Structures are given as structure tokens and as C-alpha cells.
Amino acid sequence: SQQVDKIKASYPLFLDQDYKDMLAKKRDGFEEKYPQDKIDEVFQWTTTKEYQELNFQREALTVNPAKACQPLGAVLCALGFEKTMPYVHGSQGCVAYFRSYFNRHFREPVSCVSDSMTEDAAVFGGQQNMKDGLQNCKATYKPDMIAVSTTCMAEVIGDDLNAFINNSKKEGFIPDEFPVPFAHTPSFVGSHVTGWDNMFEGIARYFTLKSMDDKVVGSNKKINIVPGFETYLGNFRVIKRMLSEMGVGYSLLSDPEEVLDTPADGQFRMYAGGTTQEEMKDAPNALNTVLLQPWHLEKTKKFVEGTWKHEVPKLNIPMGLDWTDEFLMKVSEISGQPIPASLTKERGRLVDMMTDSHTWLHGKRFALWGDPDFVMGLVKFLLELGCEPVHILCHNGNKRWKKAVDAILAASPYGKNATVYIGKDLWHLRSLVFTDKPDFMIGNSYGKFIQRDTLHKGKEFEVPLIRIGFPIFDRHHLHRSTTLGYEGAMQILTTLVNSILERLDEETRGMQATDYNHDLVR
Amino acid sequence: SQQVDKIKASYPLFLDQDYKDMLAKKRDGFEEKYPQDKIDEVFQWTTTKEYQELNFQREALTVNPAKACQPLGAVLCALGFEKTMPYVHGSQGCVAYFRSYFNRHFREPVSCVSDSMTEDAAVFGGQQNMKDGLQNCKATYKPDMIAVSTTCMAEVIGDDLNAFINNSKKEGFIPDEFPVPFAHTPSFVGSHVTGWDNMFEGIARYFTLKSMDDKVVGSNKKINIVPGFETYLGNFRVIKRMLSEMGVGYSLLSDPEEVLDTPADGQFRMYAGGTTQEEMKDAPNALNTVLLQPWHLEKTKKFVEGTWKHEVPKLNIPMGLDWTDEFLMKVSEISGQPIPASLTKERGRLVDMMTDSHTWLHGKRFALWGDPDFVMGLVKFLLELGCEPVHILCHNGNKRWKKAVDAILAASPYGKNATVYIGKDLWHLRSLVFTDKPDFMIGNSYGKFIQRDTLHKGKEFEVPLIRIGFPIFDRHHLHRSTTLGYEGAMQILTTLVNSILERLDEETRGMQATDYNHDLVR
Amino acid sequence: MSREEVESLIQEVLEVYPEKARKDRNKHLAVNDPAVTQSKKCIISNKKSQPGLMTIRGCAYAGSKGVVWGPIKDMIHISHGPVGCGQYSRAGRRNYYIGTTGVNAFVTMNFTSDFQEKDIVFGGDKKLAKLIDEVETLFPLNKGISVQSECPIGLIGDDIESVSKVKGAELSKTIVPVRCEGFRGVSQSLGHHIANDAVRDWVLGKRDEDTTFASTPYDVAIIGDYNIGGDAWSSRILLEEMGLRCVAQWSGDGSISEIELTPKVKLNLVHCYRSMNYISRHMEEKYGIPWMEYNFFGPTKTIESLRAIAAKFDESIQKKCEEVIAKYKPEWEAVVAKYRPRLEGKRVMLYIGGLRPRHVIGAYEDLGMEVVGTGYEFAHNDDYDRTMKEMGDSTLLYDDVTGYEFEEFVKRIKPDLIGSGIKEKFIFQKMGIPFREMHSWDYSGPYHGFDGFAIFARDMDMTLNNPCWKKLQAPWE
Amino acid sequence: MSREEVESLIQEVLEVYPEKARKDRNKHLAVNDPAVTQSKKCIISNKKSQPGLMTIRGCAYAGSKGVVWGPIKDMIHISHGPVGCGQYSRAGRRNYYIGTTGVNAFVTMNFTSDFQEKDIVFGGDKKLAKLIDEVETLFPLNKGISVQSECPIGLIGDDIESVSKVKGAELSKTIVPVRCEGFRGVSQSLGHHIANDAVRDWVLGKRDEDTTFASTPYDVAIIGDYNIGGDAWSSRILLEEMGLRCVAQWSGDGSISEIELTPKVKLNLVHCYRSMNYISRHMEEKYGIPWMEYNFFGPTKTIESLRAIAAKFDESIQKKCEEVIAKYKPEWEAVVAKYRPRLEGKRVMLYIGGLRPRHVIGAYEDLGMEVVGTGYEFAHNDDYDRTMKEMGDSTLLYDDVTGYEFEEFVKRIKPDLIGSGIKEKFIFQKMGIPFREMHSWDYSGPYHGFDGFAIFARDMDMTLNNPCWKKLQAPWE
Ligand code: CLF
Ligand code: CLF
Ligand SMILES: [Ca+2]
Ligand SMILES: [Ca+2]
């Protein structure tokens, strides 16, 4: 039933007595469901150390991964170039998913084409798909550039992108000088971040490899900035803002901030802003190139060093106080611009906030996950805040990275109870937050399921999620936030401290029971 | 008892069995406590329509006010001026309270002196207090200006500030030319917002009344902006940002944002930034004066119109979409500057967020309170979002203001179920949120006791608090937020929609009960 | 718009395309004529998508794993292949269920073999057998396992059928191999078919020799309701109120046991024809169970469907039918009285998958709205045959519409509301056209049945009449 | 720093003041000499604050309402006068209690007569009488009312005593008029005295003829513990483990009944001498109850205190005293072993109200810290008498310190840690000096007793040794 003045959606419609009765009847008559006592027994077993040991011996099964496949990252990388259509060679089912994944995180349009290879292409491959695909894309959506990646079907069949694109131009399907950079992006190698690196190095190589003869390091008086896979709009913004405040000439290579935040003003803009072709062509003339996320920009770094001959500085992601300091000092050194009064003040406002908030943060225990650069920056900042990052999970991490993070933990008394996990998933993390319970989780929306699982054991075992990362699907407009620089640190600090105080307010809201500690002032 | 590796503070120390037993014994032995059944009977009664009717018949008793006294506002106004010491003539107990109130909200130093009048001053008055106080303050803290307000002892005994300050100068306690603007700020008239208006009008009179002959309206090609009582740093910042982006010459008259956000860099800065004496002196030369919070700037308005001859436009606080648009268009008309493409895009980004979030906002019911201008801006934006502002409380509101809010409600289908209350307090609001339950409260930290109360009746009756206003004492760094302009609208939209989604997550977190609606994507 | 204008709109839009694509797309765009009962005279469908034109379609894996198998709540479904497919499709579809997730129910979990290069080079069958044992250890209350092939599986010549038979025999567990690799077919559609054939071959026959279940004359199953936002629950309640016994729901909130009991029913009630007609035909062939199509969108269709279903039984059910209709009459009447004045005359364009582009039209008409354009991602001509009579004359039909086409149709037709998917939504909102998600119900619903209609009406109103749509023009432009 | 050096710092700092202020402030700053037991030879206290110098002191209302009366949980305390005082003091002080707020307990609420101009001009006595009726209607389980006068009450010549006596008689209710107007005295201190005299005159004598209370030889009352973050409860627990019966707590978590039962006890245990020596003297004069000062900050003082208190009773209590001390021995030893190596040698400067500036020194010394300056807002010379023996030779004392003086003293002395109030905190954090709130305990605590010492040690360590303090200097300056 419904009452027209107070219509009930699924929640709480299905809590009405008639629906409850119907669902009980369905279960009893036809579901052959395990008895509740046995469900409870098994649940309780999944919370144990014994279960965690079996869980950590997995070799073949992955449950609730914390990574995606290469071409997702290639797509994002391509979107950051002016009037560029991302174009994934292979199966269309992939592109439907890439667009939807990003649509749900950015609450924005996400433009990407496929060339719709079918089973028929197993015989000779997708050369005709490429030929008609490029011609059709160019005519229909009028991009200035098509940046080509691959789905796993095209990789297994072994389609030669380079030859297929060259044959498309030879046969007149697209113009000879129309830019079609490409990268192979096998989903069965690394993760989405690797796809970003591959796509970027493809585009770099496209615009610079054959024209190196007239280039002179430093001649354009700028610094190239390569952001990597980045899903906070605030992160592209804050880098540009800081550099501008310093009077540093710079080129941000892959800049989707405009195309991922177009105004709702009565027209759809398929393209907005982005790195220009003129910027990529001129990039070898910069003083140097800075990689904001070096742990997934290794291929880019080899090309920038080997071909552009830039001496890429050894810089950590600019997250937290120390690493934002180091970034600004490196940029100052390269550019010869001093750090201005405005950033020095912003730095001190962050430090003020840290002094204001340190007592609530101190000794707070966190589980966290994400991509390698993001996770190590968060780990670093947590140590700066006197927090304990006890469970550090990076599903797409590698051994070298883990050694780097282990060193960071070793250089801090706050690292003493921390373990770094690589190749492990959120079902592994679930066990850790039961057996060695932290105060909070810092993670993406997939974390909500671990929070639900912990609450089910009991309120005193619940581990609340703090949503920082990618993807975030169950909150609105957090993709507008910032994690980098002093601004990002301020944002993270504020989010953490207020998560702590919100949970304390919940635990002390009990009239005549726990409300003796329900203080007005904290 | 304590275990040294997991030390317990008050929560949860006092939940140990030995403390529980001891407190039971204290209660039963010596407290002569009302039986629990009787406490539950009375509690339940305080939730009823019958109790509400009695509650709303109060004439003499105020319970949990949502306003403060005039001098608090005078102090905040004063702090907004370059190297200015707020100086409250009268009782020192008052200044200790003002300082700590603002200290707790901004988590910053708050500099303010008293001249420590005692009982003895009821014979003579506090002329000697003023002479030594001005002399002492000037020598010790070396301000460039002392801005004088009053405590209720000084108002009741009838000290003539004007004569006292003149006699101070006549007898050489401070130089004749040293600026000592003043205002009478009786705590028993109006509220803290009245204090702000009184103090600003005083400072404006001080600098302009007697030098009007040489002033020419429009000669400096600026617009004066008067912010009124404003405790969000983001609000001073967004106004200056938008006006700079527009290329509009402006003077922000009372600007405490620097002194309320000094860096923690190894030195204490008692003064920072603020409106200059030059700016105040030259303010009559502006094209016009815009009042951001007209409902507590009525005396300022009479002065600016009557003496400066500015045609102060009829603008609402620039909150939400329509009123930010109106503000920008008026500023464009006065200044002759077009609204630039940056602000046009920002506007479209807020509209985009509105379209993205509208389904979760639609029809959500709010109780809210605050100062009049803030409250009407919040009401306006809530209607723009398709929300229902059902309980609108302004303790310090007046009848004219209420008529203005009633008109705003009458002009929207979303205003149909809304009532505006003036002169009523949070004990009145507590009744309303029991008898006509809204979805949330939007209010200051005092609202957390109403949320506790509602939860005690039951989880299904709990009304979560969404902290927007002043003071906010139980969360950190919220005073850095924005509520004005498109940026402020974005911040509020985001807070609201995510408050709705966080609550929905909590109600749907129950395994095999409500978790059928625990969606990953919202 | 007249037949001549709409034909002229189709020709102007197709002008942008190279000749090959123009010639193809012309065949998938048509001006409705409700006289026509052979859609193959008017439009072609279920063909390959044109490369590079930004189709909205998915793949076979989405149609098998995400649509048919994924919702079965007490089985573990393995996304077999690399990490991508399983991750993007993890809990995107609101196929609601009652269970204890990670313990007796697994729907919103993502189990995967996360293929690495060595699995591609040397094969994944050894990994699959080891994955099955690991599943058995860590998820002991699973009542069965399905293996949902991603693109590489069949490309590299893996034999999941053999692994399924050997491991299934070893553990006495139903382990279903599904060859739904994304390179198969042209869309989600072939995934349906594959997935139905897998149910048939490995699950449905399990109880052919078992005589223990106690049947009644009023036993039905709901076939092709995936319980989006609880749609199947708000259908099932009506069917039981009418005196039927709903033995199974395929596959929303579905269990393997209720799938195994389905061959015991008297009548199969098909909601989604496109996805489940295959198994419905099989069960009529093999068990003699008749099936019928129904529609529970909006009061007109629900009433018509309840009456049609009841007519298959006896007078006691037809009687209870009229009791149900009488019970909800004031409820849906109150919904129409409130919302129809707010929506009357408003014009809608729809684009969805294989059923709802036609099935929801009656619901819109019950609020006085007009569907002026509709189309399907992957429907067949038998779907379009069922559409031409539901749509008005001179309305616009589009099959496998391109992003480009859809934007240009909308710019000309200027509908009051669009109902499509997540890849469309944010485009049209920027254009100032109210948009409702007609897949996920925009995190709302159910929309099925009488209780659904109220929610649907609420939702169309809250979006179409939202104050935000008045604000897209800056008052200085 | 040497005695000569500290003397020269005092003289440098005073160079800034006009002659009148300079001459005054010279009398309120001293270099400690622990030999000296008459502090009136070395420092002046409890005088008026010099105008314009940014004293940290509050008023008599804060001393009465905020401090003595406010914590009494089952009475309603009216802030009588305009709205400000009751609003700024609302829930600012962490005087913890068990109760059902708004129903039987009222501590964190703000009841006010919210004077308007008509109340100033024509008087508030009629309003007070109406307020009292309204309180009785809406808060029926209140067990009494206090009227806490703000500045205007006495100035306009209202007669709250009359209203209290007439309404008290009419309603058979304890209504306590308190003349704690902020213009009285020079600080919080006179407000204590006034508040004590109000307890004496209107509450304490109520059971003078009542012989029904079942007294025992071991009955004590905790006098002057306001239960900041639970401080009184972590004191009470130890007293009762020693075999004592804590009949009353004045006034943290205090009830009106336990105040009225206090004349029935055997011994009054005074923590805060400054605020409640007046009522303690009175109870010895009238009831013959002895009182003694004690200190429960840190293990050394707590053990000494437990042993001194037990020595007042018999062998049974002295025996339980040693049992308690043996029980907690391992716990505070473990705290010391963990935190003293982290804090040893660190130098602290304190500025607080009327007791803690000397009472916490022992606790600091139990962690190997040195208190190198201390002072008080509103202490009398009898407090300084008790201080000079507790501080080291050549340490800095300051009475009613100015903002300016405190800053300049800190710049020269460079303590490792400062413990003071909220008006001080953010100044010192900016200067890069670790700061702990020693009124509110920085929202932490309790700090009293053995359980309190663990938290105290945790707290000094987490702040003094926090990583943030190394970060104030940008690496490029
Ligand atoms: S058609 Fe094929 S089955 Fe369909 S969804 Fe596409 S892969 Fe999967 Fe792709 S998203 Fe990445 S590139 Fe492979 S792992 Fe998967
Ligand atoms: S010493 Fe006096 S009693 Fe003490 S606190 Fe001051 S008034 Fe109060 Fe003041 S804060 Fe405002 S101006 Fe009056 S209402 Fe009150
Ligand atoms: Ca958007
Ligand atoms: Ca601060």
C-alpha cells in the first residue's frame, strides 16, 4: 500500500508488515535457506584470526579488488587533451563500462568511442574496424585528435595499432597529419594507472620523437607537470594555482579539469579546455618535467629522460606538509622563482590547523587503500598528524614501492604498528579490520561494505569509512575536493578530525548513559 | 583502573563496572533521585503537543537562547580594522566571555581589553577607568586605533562615552589625534548583531561626519561593502574574490579575515590586515555602499544614506542562486563592469550541481535557526533546492523581517508548510521538532542537545543536526567554510545532500534487514 | 512534428556521416506507423554497431553476468578473466535481494580470477580449479558457482566446461560454465541467450526425477523481473493477493532452489520477453508449462495484466483479482489526482535496452504524458513489432542510436523529459532537459505494480517540475 | 635563569607601562623564595585589575553561577539579567554529571530572564516571579531554583530576596537569591564567597532538626571538586575503596540533597581551598565538622593525601588505605616508566585560577618536569603562602598577569610547555610552544587520582612531543 501524502520508496516500503510477511513466506517455501544459527556461526567465523589465515593463503581467487584495468586510465589521460576523443580499439562492452564508471564518480558526461570489434575480427583482426572507426569518429564528433588505446580482445588477437593507424592514413580514411597517438593497454598487465602511463607516453612520443633536432632544454622557460591518474578536480586546480602564485611558467600535460566540470547553461560541450597540441610539441623545450605521481609514471619518466633529456627530479607526490614543501623548493630551484609570501602564509595556516587539531588525531588508528602514490602521501600525512596508519593496502602496488613505504614508516615512531600489503584486496582488508581493529577506514565507496560487515558483529566493532579516493559513488560532489598541496592537507585534516568528533558525538549521545561526555566544546 | 597501553579518558573510563557500581551507590545513597519511571513519564510529556502549547505561552522565562549580547558584535566589528584594539568600557567579566566565545569558534587568539570598572564606579562613573584604560592600552599593545563599546553596568549607570573620551584627550591620557571611535552597546537592547551595527556606525561617524565638505560621490570609483556580523572566513574571502574577478574597485569596511587566520610560524601577531583608516576616511567618495546583511545594518544604512548620500540598493544577502545573481547585476550596474566569463561559469557549475543532487534534496524538511539575514538566505536557497523549510527560527528577528520571510515562503510551492518564529528559543524549537518532525536541523552547536533529546525518544524520532551558523564549537575548522555567493551555495548544497546520504546509509546499514537499500551508487 | 518533418530530421542528422555509416544508420531510424505489424518493413535491428559512432550498448558479459546470473543471490559468480569487467559491473545494477552478504548471499561482491599475463599465455584452467577450492573454503554456504567468461577465455582456448564438470563432480556442487565472452553477439542480447542456455543445460533439470515438492493449481513463476529497486517484490505481492503462489523469481532476489523448482509450476509469467523468452519457450517444449507476457507498469497495464493472468485459472482467482483491483483503486486514483495535473501534456523521449522503451509507455499515459520518441539499445524485430502499436503515429523510433543522433533528435524535438541511462543523463541535464534514469530508476523505485506507480509518479513530477530547470539561463544573458 | 636575571626580565617588561600601571604591576610579580612563608612580604594579590591591560580574569557571576552553583545538577539556575552572561557561560565548563538533561538535571541548559529595556527601567522582580511559575510548569522535577544576578540587578535596585522568600513560601520550594553581580569584587573570587554564603543561608540548614539520616563513623564529603571531565568520580572511587562513605560532592555531579546531608558527615575533605574554605569554616563553627586540605594530582600527592585522610579514622581505614595504595602501585608505576623518559627535564609554565597553579606541580614532578613559572588569576595571599614552598628557588610568580607580561615572560624563559586557559592557548601555539588547557583539560581528563594520572601523562606527552612542533619553520626560511 501507499499513502499519497507520504509515498515510501523501497526503504522503507518493504518494512511494511505485508511485505515482511510475503518475504518470510518466499524464503520458507522456496529459497531452501540455511538456518539463521548457521548463517550467524559462519559470519562469526569470517571475523576470526583462523579465517584471516585461510584468507591470506589465497593464490587464485580475488574478492572485491581495489584496482581497475589499463584502458580506464588511458581514457582519462586522453580526456585531458584539447578536443581529443578517447578511442578504445576492441570490444564496445568495455567502453560502456569505462564511461559509466567515470559518469558515476564525476556526475558528468564522459565521451569515449569504441570501434566495435566482434568475433569476426579473430580471423584477420580489427584493421577494418580501425579504418571505418577513425573515419566515423572524425566525421561525427569532429575531434582535433583521436587517442587510441586497446581492450583485452585486441591485445590477445595481437592487433598492431601502429600498422593499422598507418594503413588508415595510407588508404585515406583519416588525413595523414591528423594526430592519432596510440598505446597498447593490456588489462591483464598492472592496472588502470599503468594504462594512464602508457597512454601518456604514447601521446608524448607522437608529438616529439621525430622533431627532437630543433629542441633546446630550457628554451621555453617553463616546467612541464605530468599529473597522472587524478580524479579530484581540486588537485589539477591547486597545482595550477600554486605555480601561478609563484610566477612559474608551466605546462600541465593532460588537464581534464574543464571537460569534467562544464557548466549546466543549456548546452552540452563534448570538449572543453585541455592540454594543447602546441603545448605537447613544445614540451621538450621546458627546463624540466615534474611527475606528480612517479610510482605510475615510470614509462613516461624513461621517455622524458631518454628522449627529452630532462633531469626529472626525485620528488614524492606533493601531499602533506613535508612533501608539499619539497615540491615547492624543487620548483623554486628549477624556475629560479622564490616561494612567495602567499604560499608561506598558506603553509603556516596548515600548521596552525595541525596544532589546533592534534589532540583528537593523536594515536588514531587507520586502515586505508588506493593507488600507490595516493596511499604513500596519505600515509606520510597521517604520520605528520601523529596518527597510526596500521593497515596500508595497495592492490596494484609493487615490491619496490612497498620498500619505499616501509622506509617512511621506519623514519617515524607513528609507523611502529603499520603493515603494508600489496596484491591484496578488500576481502583481505575486511579480515584485518576485524582481527586488528582500527578506529577508521580511509577508502573509496567499496569500503561501505566493510563498514556494514563490522557493524553486524556489533556497534563496538564498527569501523566507519572516511571516503577519500576513487571511486566515490554514494556521495555527491566529493570529486571537487583537493588532496594535494597545503590546500589538500587542510581538506584532509578537517575531514579526519571531524570524522573523529562525529563518531565521538554518536558514542556519547546516550541520555544518562554516555552523554556525561557529550561536550558542547571540543 | 587503567591499562597503560590503552588508557581510557572519561569516555569510556566511567563505563567500567567499578565506576558504574560506585555511581549507582551515590545515586541511591544520597541523591534522592526521582524514580526512573517518573523521569521517563516527564520526558515523554515534554515531547507532546500539550507541553508545546504551555512552552509557547512562556512570557518571562527564556530557555536555551539563540542570540548573544550587543558588545560581542561590537568586538567583532572592531577586530576588522587595521591595528585596532576592541575596548569594552565597563565590567571585565564580559570581555573574558567575549574572547573565549570567539576563541572557541575560530580557534584563534582574540584580543580585546576592558577598563575593569568595579562597584566603586557607581558613585562617580568610569571616567577614570577610561583615562587610565586608554592610556594603558595604547602604551602596552600599541594599536593605531581603539574602538570603544560598553557593558551593561556602564549603560545602566549612564556613562557618557563621548564626554569621557574627549576628557581623556583634554587631560593628555591619549593624543588628541589618536582615533577613538565609540558606540553605546546595551546588552538589554536587540542582540550581538545590533552591537555590530552600532559599532560600525560609530566608526563611520568618527572618520567622516565632520569632513564631508570635500567629498564627491563616485570620485574614487569604488563600491563600499559592509559585511556585518560574519563568522565564516570564506565569506569575506568570496566577496573580495568575486569583486576582483569582475575588475570592480571596492573597499571592504570591517575585514577581520587576516587577524582571524594568522599563520603558526613562530610568532604571535596581535594585529593583521583589516580595513585601513584611509579606507574609512575616503569611503564617502565611493559610487555607493552595499550592505551584505541589511537586516542588522539599519542604523549604518541611515548614516550612509543621510550623511554620505549613497543610494544604498535594496539587496538581499548574496546567498543562493537568485540573490547572488541580483548582487552581481547590481554591482555591474553601479560599477559599470560586466559580469566576467569566470563568474558565469561558476554559476553554471552550481546549477549543474543542483541538477545532479535535486532528487535527494526534493521535499526534505528542515528546522533551522540563526541571525535574520543568514536565516532568510538559508530559507531562500532551500526553496531553490526544492526543500521544505518547515520550522524557521530567529530569536533575534523582528516583525518586519518576519513579514519579508513570509512573502518569500508565499512565493514558492515549497514554502507551503513553513512557519517563521521570532522571539522564540531552542527550547521552543525542541518542541517543534518533536511535534512536527523535520528530516534535519540546520543550526549551530547548541542544536546538538536537541538531537540528543530526539534520539532518546527513539532512533526513528532522531533529528540530525547539520552545523551551519555560529557558534560551532564541537567541530574543527568549519569557520573556514563559505555560505555566500555561488561558492557558498556549492558548499551548502554539498553539506546538505551528503548529510541526507550519510543518514540514509545509517538507516540501510542493517544486514539482512535494511541493507537491501544499501546502494553503492547514489 | 509531422511525418514529413521527422523524416526530414532523420535525413539532416545522417548528413554528417561517411557514406557507409549513413547507409547503415538510415535503416535503424523510422517514423512510427501503428498500422504496421511487421516491423521488418520499417526498421532493422540486432545488427553490429557502426565503429566509432559512440553506441550506448554493452556486451554479452553484461547480458549474462550483470543481468541474468549476477542477481541469483545464493550462488557465487566468477568474473573469469582480467580485473576490469567484474569491477565496473560490481553493484552497478540494483537487483535487490534479502540475504547476509559474504555469508549466504554474494550479489554485490566481485569475485574474479584477475588474469595476469601468465594466465593469458598458458591458460587459466588451472587457476580456475584452484579458485573453486578457495571459494569452497572461504564461502562454505554458497549453493553453487557460475563462471562468467570475459573476452580472453575463448580467445585463448580455455576449457571451462571441463573444469566445471570435473570440479562439480569432485565437490558435488553445481558449477555452471557460461561462455558469455564480450566478443560474442553484438550487444547484451546474445548474453541473455547464452545465459538462458546455461541455466537450461546445468541447473533447470536438476529436479526432473524428484517428486517431493507439493504443487498447487495456483503455482506460478515470475520470469524476467530482476527486482530493480524491489520491482519484483511489488509485483509478487499483487500476485499472491490474487491467490497465486509465486514459486520462483527469475532472477531478482532469486535463489538456485527456486530456479530448480520452476519446472513444477502451472504458468510462467514473463515480464522481460527479450531476456527470458528463450527459457520460457524451453519450459513449454519440455515440461508443457505455458507462458504469457505481462506488464506491471502503471495502473492501466497492471489491471489488464492481473485480469489476463487470473483468466488462466478458475473463478476463485478471478474473484480475488477483482478484490485486489478494488483494494488499490483508491490508492492509484489518489496518485493520478495529485500528479496528472502536474504532468499532463508533457512530452517524453525514451532510450533503454530491450523492454522498458515500450513497457513504460502506458505508465506515462496514465499521467497524461506523451511518448514522442523511443528506442532500444539491443531489441530484436519482435520487440519492435510489440512497440509500433504502443507508440503514437509519426513518433520517432531509433535502434542502437548514436550519441550524436540522440543529441540532435533532442535539440529538434525539445521533449519535456528524457528517460535513459547513466551515459546519457548528464548530457541532457546540461541542455536543461529534465532527465530520469530509466534503468536504475535514479536510486528510487520500485516502479512495478500499484505501489511502484506512486513512486514513479512522484519521481517524474519531482524532476520534470524541479525549480532548478528555470535557472540555467544567467539573467544577464 | 638566575634570580638576578629573572629580576631584570621583570624590570624590562614593566618599562612599557605608564607610571601608575608600572608601580602596580611591580607588586604582583616576584621571584620565588621557598624559605619565605609570609607571601605578603613578596607579592600583592586579590586587588583590582589595572584598566586596559588585558587581564584574563572573569567576574563574580562566573565564580558563583559558572563555578559553585552551575554544577548542582537537580536545580535550575537562572541567569538573571540580560542574555549575554548565561549564553557565553552555557556548557563552557566541563562539570560533569549523571542525569536526564531537561527532565531531572539541568546543568548544560541556559535559563535566563533575558532583560529588555523595560526590565531595566521598571525592574525585573515581576518578571522573576512569572519566570519562577513558568519554570515550575515546564520543569516539574526540578528540586530547587537559584537566581544568579548579573550586573544590572543590583544597579537598578531589584529585590530578588523578597521574590525568593515569597515564591519559595508559595510553592514550598528552595529558591536561592544570589547577589553575584559582576561589578562586585575584582574577579571570580568574590563570587565564590557570595555563593558559599548563599548555600549557608538558604540551603545548608534545611535538615538541622532532621535525625533520620543513618550516619556512620566513615562519612566524608568532597568539598570543592567540580568534577572536571570526571575528576570527582576518579577521586571518590579511591575514598570508597579505602572504606569511606562519600555522602556529598560539592558541587561536581552534586545534588541539592547531598548538600543538605553534608552537616551529617564526620570530615570535610577540601580540594579547592580557594572556592570553598568559607563554607568549610562555617561547618566547623556550626556543626563541629573538621576539615582538611588534600591533593589528588599525581601519585605522590594522592598517596600522601590518602594516608593523611585515613589517619583521621581507625585501624580498619588505615589498613584499607595501604590496600588501595598497593593496588594502584603497578598502574602508576607503569605510567611513570612509559612517560617520564619522554618528559624528563622539560620545563613548564602555568597560569590558572585559584588552586591548580600550585596543586598540579607534584604531578609534573612525578614525570620529571620542572615548573619554572606559575601564577594565578584571582588567588589570595593564603594561596601564595601555600605556593612558595611548592615551587623551586628563583622561579617566576605572577598574580593577575597581563597578556603582554605573559607573552614577554614566555619569549625570554622559553618553556617546553605552557598550561593555561582558552584565551592563552592559540597565542602560544603560534609561537611554537606546546600548550595544554589546564582548566578544561583540553576536553580530556579526568586528571584527579590514579586513573587521572595516566590520562594526564598521556596528554602532556602527546602535546609536548607532537610532530607538529618541528614544522613551524618553513625549510626555505
Ligand atoms: S567486452 Fe570483454 S567482456 Fe565485455 S566488458 Fe569488455 S573486456 Fe569485458 Fe574490457 S573492461 Fe578491461 S579491457 Fe578487458 S578486463 Fe574487461
Ligand atoms: S561582568 Fe557582568 S555579570 Fe559578569 S559577565 Fe559581564 S554582564 Fe555578566 Fe556583559 S556579557 Fe553582556 S554586557 Fe552584560 S549581558 Fe553579561
Ligand atoms: Ca554534473
Ligand atoms: Ca587556529
mmCIF file of N, CA and C and ligand atoms in Angstrom, chain A residues 106-108, chain B residues 352 356, chain C residues 426 430, ligand 3:
data_model
loop_
_atom_site.group_PDB
_atom_site.id
_atom_site.type_symbol
_atom_site.label_atom_id
_atom_site.label_comp_id
_atom_site.label_asym_id
_atom_site.label_seq_id
_atom_site.Cartn_x
_atom_site.Cartn_y
_atom_site.Cartn_z
ATOM 1 N N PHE A 106 32.253 11.410 -11.455
ATOM 2 C CA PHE A 106 32.308 12.848 -11.745
ATOM 3 C C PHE A 106 30.901 13.463 -11.875
ATOM 4 N N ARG A 107 29.848 12.636 -11.964
ATOM 5 C CA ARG A 107 28.456 13.151 -12.286
ATOM 6 C C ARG A 107 28.569 14.101 -13.471
ATOM 7 N N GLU A 108 29.239 13.624 -14.524
ATOM 8 C CA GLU A 108 29.468 14.406 -15.745
ATOM 9 C C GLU A 108 29.410 13.482 -16.947
ATOM 10 N N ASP B 352 24.700 23.112 -12.359
ATOM 11 C CA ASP B 352 24.969 21.728 -12.669
ATOM 12 C C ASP B 352 24.832 20.887 -11.394
ATOM 13 N N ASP B 356 22.250 17.706 -10.461
ATOM 14 C CA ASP B 356 22.839 16.422 -10.098
ATOM 15 C C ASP B 356 22.251 15.854 -8.792
ATOM 16 N N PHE C 426 23.847 13.106 -17.900
ATOM 17 C CA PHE C 426 24.484 14.402 -17.566
ATOM 18 C C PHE C 426 24.552 15.295 -18.818
ATOM 19 N N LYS C 430 22.673 19.183 -18.821
ATOM 20 C CA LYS C 430 23.374 20.380 -19.205
ATOM 21 C C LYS C 430 22.559 21.159 -20.238
HETATM 22 CA CA CA E 3 27.484 17.124 -13.111
#
